[PDB]
């Protein structure tokens with residue numbers, strides 16, 4: 500019941516693993532949700548259209564009193580079995596969704612929304628120590644994969660992310676005409692985006708077992724996250740101070756485990772747990788510290804419940820990313836089309852029941 504929290508859940512349908520968690524996460528990225536509603540999907544085929552199918556899911560999350568279905572969404576991007584989810588990381592799903600919607604926004608009043616919210620800039624470098632040669636590769640990024648093994652918290656992971664590696668000994672850099680050279684290799688952050696998607700590296704290759712295994716190591720992350728020290732050049736008008744928005748959690752050892760997401764949708768520290776169709780109020784401690792993962796001095800049970808993805812929002816952007824969404828933000832054109840789709844699927848049902856009964 501939406502009456503407990505003001506928020507509605509998503510149906511437990513098929514085997515879509517992390518999908519519901521990511522959908523709630525994107526739905527509460529209000530600036531994104533607004534842009535999604537603006538997509539000119541009138542000409543679209545509802546079986547094939549990811550943009551239309553995401554409009555439908557966001558609309559129903561905003562308006563429906565009952566849990567929201569995702570079958571037409573999964574059909575539209577073609578991940579209709581468990582295997583589809585097992586062959587992709589959560590960030591890959593996010594990119595499928597965000598790339599589809601950004602493409603549909605091309606040449607509209609919301610063109611550029613996806614990069615505006617999610618894209619940062621980095622540069623990857625290799626610097627020769629004995630000779631005058633440097634290779635610089637500038638890249639956009641939409642998410643960051645953070646190493647956790649042997650790291651206590653987010654801060655130690657970021658230190659390790661920008662750590663300078665020595666390319667020496669047998670590991671010298673092929674510097675072309677300069678020959679093999681001792682060098683140093685690193686990554687620098689130039690910008691950090693308004694909405695910062697961090698995946699934790701919990702699904703690690705293991706030689707012994709020979710495939711990926713989930714690691715349950717305790718790894719701590721804060722409500723407030725200062726990142727100025729990880730930028731090449733800071734901005735005194737806009738420090739890289741981040742506020743925790745969402746914690747995506749998994750329990751178990753495999754894709755038949757259980758996926759939930761914790762959010763404080765307003766960015767005000769008031770958290771809810773979203774567990775498919777049940778959305779419930781929760782403590783901040785339930786959202787945050789309880790998802791750090793079990794203490795290694797506790798042999799009571801297997802501690803297989805922990806965070807794998809965090810969404811942080813930049814403090815200076817918070818009021819704009821989380822801008823309020825009203826009925827006026829949904830075009831009547833789209834409202835009518837979604838009602839039309841509802842009638843059409845209300846009849847596809849009855850014709851299926853006629854031919855099967």
Ligand SMILES: Cn1nc2c(=O)n(CC3(O)CCN(C(=O)C[C@H](c4ccccc4)C(F)(F)F)CC3)cnc2c1-c1ccc(CN)cc1
Nearest residue numbers: 517588589644698699700701702713749751752753754807
């Ligand atoms: C090493 N590594 N581990 C990464 C990880 O963990 N995640 C989170 C996730 O995608 C979430 C979705 N996954 C699953 O549902 C499988 C389940 C799981 C594993 C670990 C944590 C939570 C659940 C499982 F295995 F079934 F229990 C797979 C793992 C994402 N990028 C992860 C990477 C990674 C690092 C670098 C790159 C290159 N940019 C790509 C991926």
